[PDB]
Amino acid sequence: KYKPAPLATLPSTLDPAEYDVSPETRRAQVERLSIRARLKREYLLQYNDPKRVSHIEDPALIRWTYARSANIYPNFRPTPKNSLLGAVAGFGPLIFWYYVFKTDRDRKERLIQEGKLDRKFNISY
Template sequence: MSFSNYKSSRLAALPETLDPAEYDTSPETRRAQAERLAVRARLKREYLLQYNDPNRRGLIENPALLRWTYARTTNVYPNFRPTPKNSLMGALFGIGPLIFLKKLSISLQTKLAGP
């Protein structure tokens, strides 16, 4: 890769976008990328064959989508980290409206009851 337009400077470092280590990857990295690309292409072809099948009945199950959905909905607690902010927001939005509605109902009852 040539860097003909870029001249290095004593005052500025080489930008990350021009770093040769970013683009000159090792053969192992290129091989791993090619394997991932082959797996992705195989899965895409399999999905498209199922999608375009004229005799298809029912839904097409995508295992990656099922795993993602499981991780986002059912499996929340292993991925949840309680923090002070989470606790405060939970108390504010969970208990806060109940307290507000109770105060509102009490004030309305006192107004309706009269002096």
């Protein structure tokens, strides 16, 4: 039949929480509508405002940028699983790559010391 997912959300219709007929929920919907209409009207009193020589400022956009850029460290509180994920991302993979490279180089070095590895044509390096 069908099941939800983090990608393919349950579409609009099928949602059991829709088709509800609650007066409180419908009132919440109408309040959202009042809000959105006030916003669109305040926006249209500027999109067409004559004598204008500039653009519009999107404070939602500005606040989003603030929260992604500079409001981070102040509201940041260190805790475990966070320190843990950080130390992981900062240590683990570097060291894995390093063991890889060191093993490879030691293999190559012992091979050459034996005097085997075919290096013909490796004139430029």
